[PDB]
């Protein structure tokens, strides 16, 4: 896929999961840019397990699975991102196993997405 087409597929992600939970904008927007330094709530933690969901990332459990991911890799972003992701897919595939409760699961991995990109990370 094209950097334009990951761009827009942002807000079609977000679209497919921001309606089932109670989200504030402001916070949205921080992690659409890959600032995740500000206290989430648990319907923030939710949304981002909905999106990992939608990517087949994890499992309902919020257990990362590296190996699909990195294989799911080229349908999820361009190449211009494949190798900071697939940095960050090794650097981050076991912090899940740090927590027990599955929305916070997949947000730490998603944190650790956003503190092992040079610079590039966006979430939907």
Same mark, same amino acid.
């Given at each position: 896929?094209?950097?334009? @087409?990951? %761009?827009?597929?942002?807000?079609?992600?977000? #679209?497919?999961? !921001?309606?089932?939970?109670?989200? $504030?904008? =402001?916070?949205?927007?921080?992690?659409?840019?890959?600032?995740?330094?500000?206290?989430?709530? @648990?319907? %923030?933690?939710?949304?981002?397990?909905?999106? #990992?969901?939608? !990517?087949?990332?994890?499992?309902? $459990?919020? =257990?990362?699975?590296?190996?699909?991911?990195?294989?799911?890799?080229?349908?999820?972003?361009?190449?211009?991102?494949?190798?900071?992701?697939?940095?960050?897919?090794?650097?981050?595939?076991?912090?899940?196993?740090?927590?027990?409760?599955?929305?916070?699961?997949?947000?730490?991995?998603?944190?650790?997405?956003?503190?092992?990109?040079?610079?590039?990370?966006?979430?939907?």
């Amino acid at each position: 896929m094209t950097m334009e @087409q990951f %761009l827009t597929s942002l807000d079609m992600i977000r #679209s497919g999961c !921001a309606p089932k939970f109670k989200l $504030k904008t =402001e916070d949205l927007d921080r992690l659409r840019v890959g600032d995740f330094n500000f206290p989430p709530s @648990q319907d %923030l933690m939710c949304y981002t397990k909905c999106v #990992s969901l939608m !990517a087949g990332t994890v499992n309902k $459990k919020g =257990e990362f699975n590296a190996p699909k991911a990195l294989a799911q890799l080229p349908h999820l972003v361009p190449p211009e991102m494949m190798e900071m992701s697939r940095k960050s897919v090794e650097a981050c595939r076991d912090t899940h196993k740090q927590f027990k409760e599955s929305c916070e699961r997949v947000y730490q991995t998603a944190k650790c997405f956003s503190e092992n990109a040079a610079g590039q990370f966006m979430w939907p």
